[PDB]
């Protein structure tokens, strides 16, 4: 009942956290992502977050643990896309700039070039104004 597409969806999300590929999400990797997403997690609540799903008490989340907690709550996905846009559009102007998109991928530790970023916008920017609006952003996600 867990489709092959949902699992790969969860695997790709896990690999975003697991920047070093060691198969585990640490407090560092969790906090790094949360900051790139505009939040400022306290180092203690980072610990409390890992603690809720760490079943074997090693202070890390691995993929099956990650899978277990994502699979429990698959109840329905549009506001998800909307909120995601609100994260990327820092100046609330309704458009995601290249710099607004750079400052997230840079913060994520994606290790992408400024041209690589600019090609991501280019693929997404349909009307050609150099920026990604919400409806362009929807098609990019979906």
């Amino acid at each position: 009942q867990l489709t092959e597409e949902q699992i790969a969806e969860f695997k790709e999300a896990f690999s975003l956290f697991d920047k070093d590929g060691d198969g585990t999400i640490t407090t560092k990797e969790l906090g790094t992502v949360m900051r790139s997403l505009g939040q400022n997690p306290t180092e203690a609540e980072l610990q409390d977050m890992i603690n809720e799903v760490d079943a074997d008490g090693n202070g890390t989340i691995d993929f099956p643990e990650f899978l277990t907690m994502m699979a429990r709550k698959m109840k329905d996905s549009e506001e998800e896309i909307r909120e995601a846009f609100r994260v990327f559009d820092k100046d609330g102007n309704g458009y995601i700039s290249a710099a607004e998109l750079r400052h997230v991928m840079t913060n994520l530790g994606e290790k992408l070039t400024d041209e690589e970023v600019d090609e991501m916008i280019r693929e997404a920017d349909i009307d050609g104004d150099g920026q990604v609006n919400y409806e362009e952003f929807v098609q990019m996600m979906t």
Binding site: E12, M49, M69, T142
Partner: peptide, 26 residues
């Protein structure tokens, strides 16, 4: 190319983690 859709589910994973803690704290 497969980065951006993963960001959507990454966000959901954080909401769930924060909910699990808040569930405990209450």
């Amino acid at each position: 190319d497969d980065i951006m859709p993963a960001v959507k589910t990454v966000i959901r994973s954080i909401r769930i983690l924060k909910f699990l803690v808040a569930k405990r704290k209450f």
